[PDB]
Amino acid sequence: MEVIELNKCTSGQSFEVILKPPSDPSLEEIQKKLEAAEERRKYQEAELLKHLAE
């Protein structure tokens, strides 16, 4: 229907056709999530080695 914003250049062109109208976490916090996971890994490994020591 209505064609608008027609722009032409050597490379090509663009336009808009309307047919009808309508009706973050900080570095530090990321840092603590990474360390919280690391500590859970170390804790689980510490338990394993303790169990192996027994």
Binding site: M1, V3, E5, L6, N7, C9, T10, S11, G12, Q13, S14, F15, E16, V17, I18, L19, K20, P21, P22, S23, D24, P25, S26, L27, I30, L34, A36, A37, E38, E39, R40, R41, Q44
Partner: protein, 438 residues
């Protein structure tokens, strides 16, 4: 001129990156050694193609890209391959052992050890930019690195580049070529954590690409190579406006304002036509009406779903080749009268249209025949939520039994992150149904 940096994460991101930068060079007349005989400004310049390539004083055109994988074998092939001369060493980053298809291993255990390095290699390219607009991030949903490391990278990019757009090209998992039972886990985990950090993401379901290669290229058993060459055509069609003279979509920002009114609903459906076998000698060249009409065939979508049963929030048509605006408007007129194209009430029923006169380039010795004209449609339709519903169902099946969850918990992830991620997805499915269903 405003630069874009491309980041390629994990096997899928890297190999797709390969196919794209191969294609970019072919389209811009850049040779494998990085020279570009048509670029009469030696050493620099702010042409449209410089948004993706920097220049050495020796007339070398170098991609604004970084490749990252947690294991070396895939990136080693870039380092040794045809376009080895293209990238410099600092652009290709590899670890020793991968994330083993485990989001938690990619994000927490191994991610913590390489993230600062990767951000530094990225800070380098950023420092070469007079006006960085942001990032294009390529990755799989299913891989441990693609899912887990990408989401950690995206969190940090928002910290270190708050004002910058980030766009994704994401490979949605398909059992026909997938390599891990837990990819639905990885998909939901990465989508949950990346959601607030991505401004716009183009999902490619390997299922759809696989079937387009079988059906239209007559390839009985498509390879990653077949898939990626096709994918790179869609990617090229989508980025072409950033690399060539034009008035749409001239920068990453415009991608969001043209396709994404609802911030969380930032996953536009890509549809591409025509896809023609190069082994097909006599080929009748499709018209503008025909290739436009093919944009409303699910068989041509990057994700199989039924747009008739959803609503549109936005639609962009990107034509390459022999196309004049008159024929496009005639084609859209006729299609409007046949197809089911319901827009949401608060959006205009309409199409933004871009035409680049240079027809698609095809990798010589490829599977795709050269055509006179092609189109890529980007439409933000609620129908794409079918992919979320599929994925969430698989997640629900395994998680109810806690199948495989100990692999993630063992990497230091808490179980609650599972159900949190799943809840975010349940909300996501809810947002789509609100917007698109009477």
């Amino acid at each position: 001129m405003r630069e874009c940096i491309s980041i390629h994460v994990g096997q899928a991101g890297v190999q797709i990156g390969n196919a794209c930068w191969e294609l970019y060079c072919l389209e811009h007349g850049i040779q494998p050694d990085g020279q570009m005989p048509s670029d009469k400004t030696i050493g620099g310049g702010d042409d449209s193609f410089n948004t993706f390539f920097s220049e050495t004083g020796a007339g070398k055109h170098v991609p604004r890209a970084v490749f990252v994988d947690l294991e070396p074998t895939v990136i080693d092939e870039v380092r040794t391959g045809t376009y080895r001369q293209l990238f410099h060493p600092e652009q290709l980053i590899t670890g020793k052992e991968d994330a083993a298809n485990n989001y938690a291993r990619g994000h927490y255990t191994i991610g913590k050890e390489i993230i600062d390095l990767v951000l530094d290699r990225i800070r380098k390219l950023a420092d070469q930019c007079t006006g960085l607009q942001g990032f294009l991030v390529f990755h799989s949903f299913g891989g441990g690195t693609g899912s887990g490391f990408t989401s950690l990278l995206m969190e940090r990019l928002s910290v270190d580049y708050g004002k910058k757009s980030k766009l994704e090209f994401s490979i949605y998992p398909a059992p026909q070529v997938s390599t891990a039972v837990v990819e639905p886990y990885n998909s939901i985990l990465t989508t949950h954590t990346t959601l607030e950090h991505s401004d716009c993401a183009f999902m490619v379901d390997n299922e759809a690409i696989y079937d387009i290669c079988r059906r239209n290229l007559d390839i009985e058993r498509p390879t990653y190579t077949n898939l990626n060459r096709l994918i790179s055509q869609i990617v090229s069609s989508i980025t072409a406006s950033l690399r060539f003279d034009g008035a749409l979509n001239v920068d990453l920002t415009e991608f969001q304002t043209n396709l994404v009114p609802y911030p969380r609903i930032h996953f536009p459906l890509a549809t591409y036509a025509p896809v023609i076998s190069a082994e097909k000698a006599y080929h009748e060249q499709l018209s503008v009406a025909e290739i436009t009409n093919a944009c409303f065939e699910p068989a041509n979508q990057m994700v199989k779903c039924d747009p008739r049963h959803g609503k549109y929030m936005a639609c962009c048509l990107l034509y390459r080749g022999d196309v004049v605006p008159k024929d496009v408007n005639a084609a859209i007129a006729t299609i409007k009268t046949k197809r089911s194209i319901q827009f949401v009430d608060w959006c205009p029923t309409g199409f933004k249209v871009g035409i680049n006169y240079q027809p698609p380039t095809v990798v010589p010795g490829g599977d795709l025949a050269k055509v006179q004209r092609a189109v890529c449609m980007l439409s933000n339709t609620t129908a794409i939520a079918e992919a979320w519903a599929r994925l969430d169902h698989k997640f629900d099946l395994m998680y109810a039994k806690r199948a495989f969850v100990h692999w993630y918990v063992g990497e230091g992830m808490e179980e609650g992150e599972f159900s949190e991620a799943r809840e975010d997805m349940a909300a996501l499915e809810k947002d789509y149904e609100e917007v698109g269903v009477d």
